[PDB]
Amino acid sequence: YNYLYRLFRKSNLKPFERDISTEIYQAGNKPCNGVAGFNCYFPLRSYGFRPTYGVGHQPYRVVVLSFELLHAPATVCGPKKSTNLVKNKCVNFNFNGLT
Amino acid sequence: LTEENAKTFLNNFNQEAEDLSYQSSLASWNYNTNITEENAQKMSEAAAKWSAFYEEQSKTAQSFSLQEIQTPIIKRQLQALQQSGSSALSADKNKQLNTILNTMSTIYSTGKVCNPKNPQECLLLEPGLDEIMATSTDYNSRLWAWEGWRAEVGKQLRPLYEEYVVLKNEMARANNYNDYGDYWRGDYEAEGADGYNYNRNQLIEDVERTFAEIKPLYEHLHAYVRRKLMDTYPSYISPTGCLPAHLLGDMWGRFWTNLYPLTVPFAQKPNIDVTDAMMNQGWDAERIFQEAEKFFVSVGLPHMTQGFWANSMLTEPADGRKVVCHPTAWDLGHGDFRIKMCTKVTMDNFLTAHHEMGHIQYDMAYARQPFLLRNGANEGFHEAVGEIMSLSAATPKHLKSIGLLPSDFQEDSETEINFLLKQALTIVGTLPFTYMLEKWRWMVFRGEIPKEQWMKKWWEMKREIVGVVEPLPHDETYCDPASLFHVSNDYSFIRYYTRTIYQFQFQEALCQAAKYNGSLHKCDISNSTEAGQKLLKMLSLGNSEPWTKALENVVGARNMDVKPLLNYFQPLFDWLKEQNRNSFVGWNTEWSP
Numbered sequence: 001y002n003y004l005y006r007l008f009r010k011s012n013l014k015p016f017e018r019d020i021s022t023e024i025y026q027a028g029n030k031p032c033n034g035v036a037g038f039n040c041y042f043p044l045r046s047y048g049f050r051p052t053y054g055v056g057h058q059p060y061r062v063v064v065l066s067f068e069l070l071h072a073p074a075t076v077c078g079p080k081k082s083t084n085l086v087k088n089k090c091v092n093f094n095f096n097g098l099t
Numbered sequence: 100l101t102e103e104n105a106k107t108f109l110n111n112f113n114q115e116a117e118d119l120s121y122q123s124s125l126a127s128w129n130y131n132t133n134i135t136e137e138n139a140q141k142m143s144e145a146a147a148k149w150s151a152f153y154e155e156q157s158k159t160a161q162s163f164s165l166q167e168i169q170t171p172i173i174k175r176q177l178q179a180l181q182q183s184g185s186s187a188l189s190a191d192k193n194k195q196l197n198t199i200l201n202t203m204s205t206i207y208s209t210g211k212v213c214n215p216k217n218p219q220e221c222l223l224l225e226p227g228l229d230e231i232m233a234t235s236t237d238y239n240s241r242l243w244a245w246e247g248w249r250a251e252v253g254k255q256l257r258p259l260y261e262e263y264v265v266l267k268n269e270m271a272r273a274n275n276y277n278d279y280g281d282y283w284r285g286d287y288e289a290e291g292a293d294g295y296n297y298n299r300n301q302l303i304e305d306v307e308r309t310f311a312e313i314k315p316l317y318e319h320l321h322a323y324v325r326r327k328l329m330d331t332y333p334s335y336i337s338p339t340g341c342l343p344a345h346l347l348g349d350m351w352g353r354f355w356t357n358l359y360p361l362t363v364p365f366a367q368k369p370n371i372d373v374t375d376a377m378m379n380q381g382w383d384a385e386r387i388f389q390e391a392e393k394f395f396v397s398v399g400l401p402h403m404t405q406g407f408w409a410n411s412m413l414t415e416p417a418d419g420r421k422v423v424c425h426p427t428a429w430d431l432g433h434g435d436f437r438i439k440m441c442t443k444v445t446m447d448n449f450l451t452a453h454h455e456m457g458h459i460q461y462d463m464a465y466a467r468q469p470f471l472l473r474n475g476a477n478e479g480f481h482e483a484v485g486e487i488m489s490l491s492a493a494t495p496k497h498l499k500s501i502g503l504l505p506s507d508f509q510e511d512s513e514t515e516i517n518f519l520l521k522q523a524l525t526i527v528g529t530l531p532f533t534y535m536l537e538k539w540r541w542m543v544f545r546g547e548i549p550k551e552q553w554m555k556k557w558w559e560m561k562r563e564i565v566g567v568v569e570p571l572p573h574d575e576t577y578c579d580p581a582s583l584f585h586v587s588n589d590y591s592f593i594r595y596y597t598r599t600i601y602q603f604q605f606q607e608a609l610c611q612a613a614k615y616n617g618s619l620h621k622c623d624i625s626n627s628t629e630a631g632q633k634l635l636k637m638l639s640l641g642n643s644e645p646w647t648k649a650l651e652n653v654v655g656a657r658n659m660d661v662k663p664l665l666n667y668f669q670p671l672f673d674w675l676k677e678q679n680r681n682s683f684v685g686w687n688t689e690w691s692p
């Protein structure tokens with residue numbers, strides 16, 4: 001019961017936005033006044049994960065990698081393979097970007 | 100707005116309901132596969148919490164007015180949620196009704212009839228008296244068992260039924276129903292688009308119309324059974340009279356399947372039993388369920404889940420825990436589908452495995468629907484969609500395809516005739532009993548039958564509809580229907596009749612879909628994806644739509660039809676007509692010996 005999700009919200013989320021508010025969702029015309037009941041529901045509901053659930057309901061961990069480029073120099077670059085060194089022969093050399 | 104409020108209320112309700120229902124179903128499963136006091140009490144608290152939450156949500160759901168809801172799925176969900184059931188009465192009346200139900204349950208489970216002049220030979224129904232009804236041939240012993248259980252159940256259950264009827268009538272009129280019969284007929288009520296409208300009061304006339312043309316086939320079967328029993332019992336059965344109530348192979352005459360050795364057409368020809376073939380090839384329950392899964396994927400329905408194989412029990416555990424012998428298919432929720440069956444390596448358990456996996460496939464198909472709509476279209480659809488798999492699994496084509504039956508097996512007409520007769524004794528013979536019992540209960544709840552003339556009406560209708568006469572005269576201090584399990588424990592009985600009609604309707608529709616060119620009883624739906632898709636269109640719906648729409652989706656008709664039932668039994672009907680030329684077809688209402 002330690003994994004939660006938001007089921008009710010007044011408007012849709014914008015891209016890359018989070019909502020950690022625990023305000024009672026007011027679905028009707030009457031004010032909720034902080035107390036749950038009819039037409040006033042707590043928005044955060046628990047993901048009650050159990051091992052005997054069907055494959056569509058088992059817990060899945062998701063990591064989203066978002067890549068961005070700005071005006072700054074890009075400093076997250078993948079490894080460039082360093083082959084063995086050969087001496088005394090005519091070999092095309094690429095040393096630290098100097099070719 | 101009211102519709103948006105109902106949508107948010109249902110969105111809030113479904114997740115909590117699914118969680119609590121899963122907890123209740125898991126506790127019930129844990130009790131059913133491991134019987135002990137702690138599992139029983141855990142099941143008690145889980146069911147108490149789930150029922151309390153359901154009634155609490157239902158009281159809030161009744162505040163909504165359906166006159167301003169346009170979308171039929173939300174309206175159907177709110178209709179399903181607003182069924183209060185037994186909670187509409189006050190606490191005193193509800194407690195009294197629950198007390199009556201509990202005392203009926205604990206007096207039926209402990210029913211006792213004992214031998215006159217031999218006081219040590221006292222017999223219960225479940226271990227010994229059912230054996231007497233199924234196997235014994237002695238007239239006096241069956242007369243003793245029937246009359247004794249009738250006396251020691253009817254005398255003790257007549258006043259209990261007297262206030263049971265009144266309390267159920269009060270509950271139904273508290274729930275805006277005419278009587279308790281109308282409350283049961285409200286399960287078949289469909290409100291929807293034009294032309295799909297079905298009413299409760301329509302159902303009775305529909306049943307009578309479908310019983311208008313089953314009557315010649317039942318009359319021929321009754322005449323044949325009467326002649327064979329006359330061969331068995333020389334002077335105690337009349338040619339023009341009705342059958343005695345204690346010679347029908349069961350305690351109540353519900354199933355005629357125990358009359359097959361006495362009423363066999365061809366005793367020299369064996370049955371289509373393949374148990375010994377399973378013994379020779381070393382089959383086990385895992386192979387039985389794997390073959391059932393192979394059948395369900397050959398027809399086009401999806402494969403079984405990993406949780407089904409991991410969590411179910413398919414064998415007697417034998418590690419010290421008590422289990423229930425009855426096979427049951429469980430839809431626990433959240434994609435959890437299990438089967439509890441103590442499967443022995445027999446043909447009957449193979450067919451039962453196909454039936455329960457049909458139940459599980461039916462449960463799996465409507466998982467995309469909301470929680471309140473994860474049910475059958477009505478009470479008959481759920482068992483019919485398993486009975487069709489039981490029908491298709493038992494065919495000689497299916498057994499020859501999977502290697503159980505040899506490739507050079509010859510299917511002569513005689514084995515088809517006796518197999519069809521056994522199927523008729525199990526299936527056709529229960530239909531007049533079901534119709535007469537449901538009609539009696541409806542007229543008792545309605546008040547059409549006077550209170551002091553209950554028994555005299557019932558034995559008239561059994562003389563008229565079922566064609567079965569009482570062996571001894573019974574006065575009104577008896578309660579002869581109440582000896583049955585379904586009526587003493589508050590269960591609807593018309594589901595079997597609708598199951599029987601829908602089973603053959605579905606079977607003919609699938610066989611026409613699969614382009615089978617032979618007799619309906621030999622039909623197999625294996626290796627036909629189009630029939631599977633045609634079926635799965637109805638299975639995916641659940642009760643989101645009216646049941647008439649689902650029936651049109653499968654068979655192309657919007658009402659019950661018994662032409663598939665007569666088409667299934669057509670060779671047998673011709674055979675029964677051929678051997679009833681000299682005899683008299685039909686029965687006389689007056690008591691003939």
Ligand SMILES: *[C@@H]1O[C@H](CO)[C@@H](O)[C@H](O)[C@H]1NC(C)=O
Pocket residue numbers: 133135137418420
């Ligand atoms: C049945 O329940 C008891 C009580 O908790 C438990 O000890 C036992 O292990 C259960 N049986 C199985 C097969 O798990």
Ligand SMILES: *[C@@H]1O[C@H](CO)[C@@H](O)[C@H](O)[C@H]1NC(C)=O
Pocket residue numbers: 397500625626
């Ligand atoms: C259906 O397909 C399976 C797949 O191997 C096959 O074994 C079986 O013989 C087929 N049945 C018929 C009737 O062709």
